[PDB]
């Protein structure tokens, strides 16, 4: 759960990332209009600079790939651009065509999302005007335009056979565009089949997955919750709204003795006491890393705060219906990563490091662990 | 009150001006490796301002 490798793009800040079909190159869109190709075929943790495509003045907001040959990018000047990325070709790194969307009169226009459709050889793009446009890739022209949304179209996604294109955005709606019918396939015409309102706020991220046993259209956004649908039965199929907070890792603990609740969120720990509830103490930590886990001794005097980087133990003394905080120094814990920490007694603890090296500390006695077959 | 905040700001500074030269502190290597780099405020703010622009009348 740590950063294996940090690689700098050699360009402006990143806005969009996308991988090609063969999964050996990353395309990285930049604020200064550049699109950088990074090679990852070397191996895990290996990222090498491959090439810089032709430059331009508009911010690249999104990227999509056609196999490994062409890089399609949406820009902040209201234009869709096709770069050639194929090697062994004189046109490598050049801007083949430029397409322009309808531009809002009293506002700037942005192409938030672009996706490539292998079956029909079309590009589907969403812009800030609320339009979904289907472009013919070979000739770089508009085949169809749908004024569907009332606001920005922030994401697009397609099914496996490209019989469905799903859009979503600020207006909280999910529009299904269908080309399943045989006459539609012959004529290559998309249709605004249906729409649904499932989210309470914006829809920023959407994805689709299909398999012989699975059919998911998962979406999420500012509401901070997932919404799951069926791609094939989107119009009429049931949907599930996942819980906002599903506490697999607990962020709050309770001490039966002295009646204390302790909650830790974003490097800050709050302690309350109940007879009616009073905040006895708040603990603020300098480190940027969020607290992974907090364990309190049965007596409640000793509080251990664990992070992947360091583990700090603070002693609490109740004074004047308030807790006095002191940081006991233990160098071994400070250099120790703490995935999980528990108390044996008021004195001894067990810590499971990020490398799964379990050991006991008195306030290290390592414990053997059975080897897991690969 | 505010001086305590300003004192906190003074501790949270990685450079100081020694005349025409500015000495700057270098962060620990683990700090960079352990955690990804910070977001650039102007860039993220531009995205959020647009999505919350007045014309949408999100109200």
């Amino acid at each position: 759960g740590l950063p294996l490798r940090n690689y700098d793009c050699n360009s402006g800040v990143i806005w969009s990332i996308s991988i090609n079909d063969s999964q050996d190159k990353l395309s990285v869109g930049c604020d200064n209009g550049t699109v950088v190709l990074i090679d990852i075929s070397g191996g895990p943790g290996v990222l090498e600079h491959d090439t810089i495509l032709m430059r331009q003045e508009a911010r690249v907001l999104t990227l999509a790939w056609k196999k490994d040959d062409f890089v399609i990018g949406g820009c902040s000047d209201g234009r869709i651009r096709i770069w050639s990325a194929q090697k062994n070709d004189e046109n490598m790194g050049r801007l083949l065509h430029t397409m322009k969307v309808d531009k809002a009169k009293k506002e700037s226009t942005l192409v938030w999302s672009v996706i490539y459709l292998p079956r029909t050889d079309q590009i589907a793009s969403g812009d800030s005007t609320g339009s979904i446009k289907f472009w013919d890739f070979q000739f770089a022209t508009l085949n169809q335009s749908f004024k569907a949304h009332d606001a920005d179209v922030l994401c697009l996604t397609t099914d496996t056979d490209n019989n469905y294109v799903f859009s979503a955005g600020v207006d909280r709606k999910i529009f299904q565009f269908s080309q399943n019918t045989n006459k539609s396939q012959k004529n290559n015409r998309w249709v605004n089949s249906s729409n649904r309102l499932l989210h309470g706020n914006d829809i920023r991220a959407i994805c689709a997955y299909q398999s012989k046993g699975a059919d998911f259209l998962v979406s999420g956004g500012v509401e901070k919750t997932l919404v799951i649908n069926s791609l094939t039965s989107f119009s009429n199929g049931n949907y599930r709204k996942m819980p906002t907070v599903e506490p697999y890792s607990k962020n709050v603990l309770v001490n039966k003795e002295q009646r204390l609740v302790v909650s830790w969120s974003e490097s800050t720990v709050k302690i309350w006491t109940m007879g009616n509830y009073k905040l006895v103490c708040k603990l603020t930590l300098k480190d940027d890393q969020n607290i992974s886990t907090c364990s309190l001794s049965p007596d409640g005097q000793v509080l251990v705060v664990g992070r992947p980087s360091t583990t700090k133990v603070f002693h609490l003394q109740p004074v004047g219906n308030k807790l006095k905080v002191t940081k006991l120094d233990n160098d071994l814990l400070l250099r120790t990563s703490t995935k999980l920490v528990k108390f044996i007694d008021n004195s001894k603890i067990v810590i499971c490091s990020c490398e799964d090296d379990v050991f006991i500390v008195d306030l290290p006695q390592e414990v053997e662990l059975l080897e897991v077959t690969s | 009150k505010t001086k305590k905040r300003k004192t906190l700001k003074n501790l949270r500074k990685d450079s100081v001006k020694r005349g025409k030269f500015r000495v700057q502190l270098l962060s620990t290597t683990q700090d960079s490796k352990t955690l990804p780099p910070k977001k650039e405020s102007s860039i993220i703010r531009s995205k959020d301002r647009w999505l919350n622009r007045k014309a949408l009348n999100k109200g």
Binding site: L279, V280, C281, K282, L283, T284, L285, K286, K322, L323, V325, K327 | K4, T7, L8, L11, R12
Partner: peptide, 14 residues
Amino acid sequence: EDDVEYNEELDDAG
């Protein structure tokens, strides 16, 4: 709540 507050870095400094 500043009556009950504790700051590590301020305590570290003094």
